[PDB]
Design a protein around this ligand. Sequence first.
Ligand SMILES: *[C@@H]1O[C@H](CO)[C@@H](O)[C@H](O)[C@H]1NC(C)=O
Ligand SMILES: *[C@@H]1O[C@H](CO)[C@@H](O)[C@H](O)[C@H]1NC(C)=O
Ligand SMILES: *[C@@H]1O[C@H](CO)[C@@H](O)[C@H](O)[C@H]1NC(C)=O
Ligand SMILES: *[C@@H]1O[C@H](CO)[C@@H](O)[C@H](O)[C@H]1NC(C)=O
Lengths: 49, 175, 49, 118, 20, 47
Amino acid sequence: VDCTMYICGDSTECSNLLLQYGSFCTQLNRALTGIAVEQDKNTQEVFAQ
Amino acid sequence: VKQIYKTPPIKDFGGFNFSQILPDPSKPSKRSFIEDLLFNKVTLICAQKFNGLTVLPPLLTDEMIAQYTSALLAGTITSGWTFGAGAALQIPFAMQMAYRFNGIGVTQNVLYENQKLIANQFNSAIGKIQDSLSSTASALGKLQDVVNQNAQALNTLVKQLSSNFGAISSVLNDI
Amino acid sequence: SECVLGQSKRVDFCGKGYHLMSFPQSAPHGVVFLHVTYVPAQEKNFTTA
Amino acid sequence: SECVLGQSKRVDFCGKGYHLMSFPQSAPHGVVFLHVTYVPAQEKNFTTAPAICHDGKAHFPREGVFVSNGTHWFVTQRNFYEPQIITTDNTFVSGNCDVVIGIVNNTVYDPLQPELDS
Amino acid sequence: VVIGIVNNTVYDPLQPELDS
Amino acid sequence: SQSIIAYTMSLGAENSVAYSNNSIAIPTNFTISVTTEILPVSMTKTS
Ligand SMILES: *[C@@H]1O[C@H](CO)[C@@H](O)[C@H](O)[C@H]1NC(C)=O
Ligand SMILES: *[C@@H]1O[C@H](CO)[C@@H](O)[C@H](O)[C@H]1NC(C)=O
Ligand SMILES: *[C@@H]1O[C@H](CO)[C@@H](O)[C@H](O)[C@H]1NC(C)=O
Ligand SMILES: *[C@@H]1O[C@H](CO)[C@@H](O)[C@H](O)[C@H]1NC(C)=O
């Protein structure tokens, strides 16, 4: 999920305002990427033996 | 393990070399030869003091963990698995290898004839870990990644104070 | 408990292949296992019955 | 599934040391297990040898170990004190005595001799 | 009963010492 | 004169077992103990 797009989208005023919330979007994106990588990790561990 | 076992200085293991794993008094610390490389490779460190952050030292210091590891090592060497189930009944390593060969499904003879080559192969394999760890920085991946994740999470938490969250300013005193 | 204080009857739990023993090694915020296993080599094409 | 439904060979999982059996007990939002262990005691150590040489061929204890009280040698299971005379019925042979290191010269009794009378 | 059983001689360790 | 002390916790007892290539220790009188284990199963079904 794109945090900036989901919260604001194409609008620019909302995107500018959201910068006041620090790096919550970055943290959420990092967590989602970690989960996505972990999915492939589990798939490989279970199947690629 | 409830007791701290030790290896007699003779260390007559019939060609099996435990220098890499057993404690090394030569170094300032009592940790084994391999341990030093692992700690050096593993080691935003000691730079979190502001904003009320504090770190509690672990209950079991590194020296205590090394002592526990050395005790487990000594128990495994002489007593094999016997000390993990009762009294530490010492058995020669040359014959402990034969006893284990029986568990997997190999007769004690194979070892009783090939002991020299078996010990040489064991020493080479255990001794080759040093070079592999030294030449490869990804061998300690898990600990490095978890430490980096914790460090970056703490850094992000600290930096969050720099965001006003829609307020006029990010400093209470200025407001 | 299993790899060090005994011989693990499981498979691919203590090292690769048949387990023999494991010599524990400590590490910062972790532990390193020197798994020792048995690996056959030099297979042949003998006949059975 | 392992401690109660059967016997577990896992170490310090179904009980401290060699596991024997377990008896589950009901508890509020919990389980109380009365594990039964088997811990050897009354230690005693003797002299040993890897193999035994009788007539130029190396003998091995098969399912036991070579021990001795200083007067008589015996073959017994490593996990208990059950001495027995070195006999082919509990001993197997492979290879010569030269290759083996630490081999101790001794005589292997033949259980056939008592039956070879008359 | 066995399937694939092969025929080969089997030695008796007690044959040389059978005589009393 | 009971008080509170601040010491370095002992890492268990110290027992160095004599080890030689010609010596083996074999038990003679086994003992049986009972190891109690406790493990929670579920929480209260609060809603
Ligand atoms: C073993 O023999 C089979 C047939 O007898 C053959 O197909 C196979 O390639 C052989 N493998 C080796 C390693 O000799
Ligand atoms: C080993 O034997 C010696 C005597 O040879 C004895 O003093 C010692 O207590 C024994 N230790 C064990 C663990 O049996
Ligand atoms: C055991 O050690 C002694 C001296 O420490 C040595 O003389 C002896 O040969 C060793 N045992 C074997 C089987 O080599
Ligand atoms: C083994 O395979 C060969 C070739 O197909 C066949 O002639 C033979 O009967 C088979 N024997 C058994 C015991 O399956």
